[PDB]
Amino acid sequence: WKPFETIILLTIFANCVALAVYLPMPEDDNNSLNLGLEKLEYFFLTVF
Amino acid sequence: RRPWYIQGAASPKDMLILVDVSGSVSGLTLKLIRTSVSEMLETLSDDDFVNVASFNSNAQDVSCFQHLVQANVRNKKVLKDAVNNITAKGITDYKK
Numbered sequence: 429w430k431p432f433e434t435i436i437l438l439t440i441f442a443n444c445v446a447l448a449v450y451l452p453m454p455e456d457d458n459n460s461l462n463l464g465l466e467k468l469e470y471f472f473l474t475v476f
Numbered sequence: 477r478r479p480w481y482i483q484g485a486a487s488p489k490d491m492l493i494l495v496d497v498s499g500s501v502s503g504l505t506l507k508l509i510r511t512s513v514s515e516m517l518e519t520l521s522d523d524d525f526v527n528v529a530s531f532n533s534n535a536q537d538v539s540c541f542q543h544l545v546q547a548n549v550r551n552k553k554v555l556k557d558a559v560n561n562i563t564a565k566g567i568t569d570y571k572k
Binding site for chain 2: 453454455456457458
């Protein structure tokens with residue numbers, strides 16, 4: 429019953445932002461920022 | 477692009493053409509890279525030496541040659557036919 433909304437909302441908003449700045453590359457290519465955004469989907473999948 | 481001009485403009489060369497065949501080049505830029513490598517091979521003479529390599533998370537010779545060859549009409553034919561068979565897939569690794 430603590431103010432949980434004003435933290436999980438910011439977490440899901442940061443998850444949305446990390447979904448947005450993801451760059452889709454053709455044919456199995458990747459860059460540096462796309463690798464650090466999959467290690468961030470372990471901080472966003474463990475909180476939820 | 478005339479042989480006499482290229483011959484009198486600069487000394488012979490040891491060219492190595494390093495081509496990027498990672499995934500990001502698929503589409504228009506791979507086709508342009510193929511045409512560009514062919515047009516670059518057409519500026520070489522029999523005193524120059526050449527080899528075409530290709531890298532995507534792994535670097536390998538694009539042809540059967542494995543080192544610098546003499547850049548005559550037959551060797552350049554081989555290199556052109558080997559370049560025109562390139563397909564784009566993988567990760568880009570400039571260090572390799």
